[PDB]
């Protein structure tokens, strides 16, 4: 056929993002452990993630602008994955030279690399896979990060011990080569990017509702994630859970997302009015928060619906900006959405942390429910607006 019924491009697209979604959780997988290397306190070790979230909104907006204007869709991925690999190798160098500000500088590049790669992947998948099987590629893109993060978390820890036993006991400088052996993932992203560019070379031969969709994305993705980030402490007080078995509840909204999102992506495009699906997902999220906050029913039931209402809102809301704004402008709208969502998460994490100790736990759930209510109001307003024009 054209390109073998999109099979090879579908296979290659999912493997592109190992540059960002694999090596992102190195400090998380290396919690403590490297703390006793030279000297590390808890306050400083959170700076390895601040550089990945705060200097991001303007930089990702600039990256999207560059994709739209100068670089184009083709060469955007190859340069951003190059930035990713440069950041990873300079992080490894900072590890090997024992300097810490060399370690810190790696995040100032890896953040732009990851966010720009994500926005480029999104816009490219929208540009090419349009027409049929559209919502599904977002499903695999979401599933790949969750299927890779845990694997990296286990594998880096295993390789630390393997290298320590095999090579020997040096002056605890082996973490640098340990990062280097983990750096081999990023080169695969480069190879995939050049292969995709070659295929594309061979292949060749705003508006009102956009603001509302931005509001939906901000509201939902800012009222869902920090609740999971809070996690441990709330369930040890509101309910009586053991210190070990309580990790199943907090880490099940993620582990149920990846094995499910492709199914919803495959189902939605086939006879699906997207607005109805989004409204159903938002109503389910509201019901889940109400049940969790205002009653002592089993948290399993209240947290199960969140998995579906988060795996269904994804790969069924982002394609809305694929139809509203026409081609030649996706690279800016997607970057704007990423910037506003990241800024919302960053500004609300601090607010939630500040209000938690000052007012307790009921007010936090009240505020979250208010945010989701605003999300639903904007969803139904978007439904109302689309009634007149349509299509």
């Amino acid at each position: 056929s054209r390109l073998a019924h999109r099979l090879v491009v579908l296979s290659l697209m999912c493997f592109l993002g190992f540059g960002s979604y694999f090596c992102y959780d190195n400090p998380a997988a290396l919690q403590t452990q490297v703390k006793r290397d030279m000297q590390v306190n808890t306050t400083k070790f959170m700076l390895l993630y601040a550089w990945y979230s705060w200097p991001n909104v303007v930089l990702c907006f600039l990256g999207g602008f560059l994709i739209d204007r100068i670089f184009g869709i083709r060469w955007g991925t190859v340069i951003f994955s190059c930035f990713v690999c440069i950041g990873q190798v300079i992080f490894a160098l900072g590890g090997i030279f024992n300097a810490f500000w060399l370690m810190e500088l790696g995040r100032f590049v890896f953040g732009i690399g990851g966010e720009s790669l994500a926005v480029a992947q999104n816009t490219y998948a929208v540009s090419w896979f349009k027409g049929k099987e559209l919502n599904l590629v977002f499903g695999l893109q979401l599933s790949m990060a969750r299927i890779g993060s845990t694997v990296n978390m286990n594998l880096m820890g295993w390789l630390y011990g393997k290298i320590e036993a095999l090579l020997g006991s040096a002056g605890h400088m082996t973490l640098g080569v340990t990062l280097m052996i983990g750096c081999i993932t990023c080169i695969f992203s480069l190879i995939c990017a050049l292969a995709l560019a070659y295929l594309d070379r061979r292949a060749e031969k705003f508006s009102l509702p956009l603001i509302l969709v931005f509001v939906i994305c901000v509201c939902y993705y800012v009222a869902v994630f920090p609740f999971i980030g809070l996690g441990k402490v709330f369930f040890m007080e509101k309910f009586r859970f053991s210190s070990q078995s309580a990790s199943a509840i907090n880490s099940i909204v993620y582990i149920i997302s990846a094995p499910m999102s492709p199914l919803f992506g495959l189902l939605v495009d086939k006879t699906g009015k997207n607005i109805i699906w989004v409204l159903y997902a938002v109503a389910a999220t509201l019901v889940s928060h109400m049940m969790l906050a205002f009653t002592f029913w089993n948290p399993w039931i209240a947290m199960c619906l969140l998995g579906f209402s988060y795996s269904l809102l994804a790969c069924a809301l982002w394609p809305m900006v694929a139809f509203i704004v026409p081609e030649h402008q996706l690279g800016t709208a997607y970057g704007f959405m990423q910037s506003i969502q990241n800024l919302g998460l960053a500004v609300i994490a601090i607010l939630a942390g500040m209000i938690l100790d000052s007012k307790g736990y009921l007010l936090l759930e009240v505020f979250f429910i208010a945010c989701v209510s605003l999300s639903l109001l904007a969803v139904v307003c978007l439904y109302l607006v689309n009634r007149a024009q349509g299509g």
Binding site: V233, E237, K238, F294, F296, L356, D357, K359, G360, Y361, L362, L363, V366, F367, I369, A370, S373, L374, L376, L377, V380, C381, L384, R387, A388
Partner: protein, 341 residues
């Protein structure tokens, strides 16, 4: 809405401390009596009459078995008592090697009239040992109430103008080991032959004293009567913030025989049973997290008195935010009709 009144008595042969609290309303009176002769103690008296007084006789109290009663004998109903008989040193250095307890019977408690002040309705008890507590000792803080309201102290409760408050603390102590675990031995005394039932309740609201949703209780009878109540927390420093949780644990009620705990003369004067004592240990904290090592003092809060035990009431703030949250679905149905036209 009920009145308050304090009063103290001293005996010439041997002066001692005795605080008596009387609350009178429309057609009910309370007769809290706080004695600290050997142990601290509390005895409750309920009278349906609106006039009733005491009859003290220091001569009998000078094996005393005298009578300390009220004139309207027919109005006597639901006489209960508590005795803070012992303070337990719990060590449990591994996860517990029960260091011998300190007897709350040899402490020379200071004068009540020195610290008593009717303006704030408070008094202080401070005994110190005679052989630990070299600088400072237990500081009982009795307090009455006049109208329904909410205290401003970090441990926030809900008094009903018909109960008391017993913030108990001890300032200055030298632990016998590098660990912090303290306990009290509360010994109740039911009027009828039975075992008082302790339960545990769940509450939704957490605006007050965050990170706790349980409100303990202790009822001497399934009827309108007296009740204990205390949030399962304990504070070690005056700026009682959410950091110093230091959880406390209850136990199960036993049926201990006499002579297992020192006998308070006031209880023996008010009662004649002295055989149905039920006691349970009451520990503070755990080695799991923060303990009592940096500071030198531990605080606790509880209520005591007869009436209907308050549960909780939702504040207007959360109700209003729920109301505005419910406004979002209703707002569009108005807007939908607007576009319909």
């Amino acid at each position: 809405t009920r009145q308050v009144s304090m009063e103290v008595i001293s005996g010439w042969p041997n002066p001692q401390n005795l605080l008596h609290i009387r609350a009178v309303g429309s057609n009910s009176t309370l007769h809290y009596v706080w004695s600290s002769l050997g142990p601290p103690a509390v005895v409750l008296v309920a009278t349906n009459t609106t006039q009733s007084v005491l009859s003290v006789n220091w001569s009998l109290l000078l094996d005393p078995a005298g009578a300390l009663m009220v004139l309207p004998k027919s109005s006597i109903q639901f006489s209960s008592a508590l005795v803070f008989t012992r303070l337990l040193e719990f060590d449990s250095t591994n996860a517990g090697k029960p260091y011998p307890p300190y007897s709350l019977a040899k402490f020379s408690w200071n004068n009540i009239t020195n610290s008593l002040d009717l303006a704030n309705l408070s008094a202080d008890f401070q005994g110190r040992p005679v052989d630990a507590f070299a600088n400072g000792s237990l500081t009982f803080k009795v307090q009455a109430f006049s109208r329904s309201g909410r205290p401003a102290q970090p441990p926030r409760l809900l008094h009903t103008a018909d109960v008391c408050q017993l913030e108990v603390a001890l300032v200055g102590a030298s632990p016998r080991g590098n660990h912090s675990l303290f306990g009290l031995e509360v010994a109740t005394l039911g009027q009828g032959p039975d075992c008082p039932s302790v339960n545990e309740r769940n509450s939704i609201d957490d605006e007050y004293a965050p990170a706790v949703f349980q409100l303990n209780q202790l009822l001497w009878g399934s009827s309108p009567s007296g009740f204990m109540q205390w949030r399962p927390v304990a504070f070690s420093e005056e700026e009682r913030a959410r950091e110093s949780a230091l959880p406390c644990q209850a136990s199960t009620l036993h049926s201990t025989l006499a002579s297992s705990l020192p006998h308070s003369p006031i209880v023996q004067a008010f009662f004649g049973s002295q055989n149905n004592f039920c006691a349970f240990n009451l520990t503070f904290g755990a080695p799991t997290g923060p303990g009592y090592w940096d500071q030198y003092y531990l605080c606790w809060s509880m209520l005591l008195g007869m009436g209907f035990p308050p549960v909780d009431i939702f504040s207007p703030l959360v109700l209003g935010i729920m109301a505005v949250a419910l406004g979002a679905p209703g707002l569009m149905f108005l807007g939908g009709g607007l576009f319909l036209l």
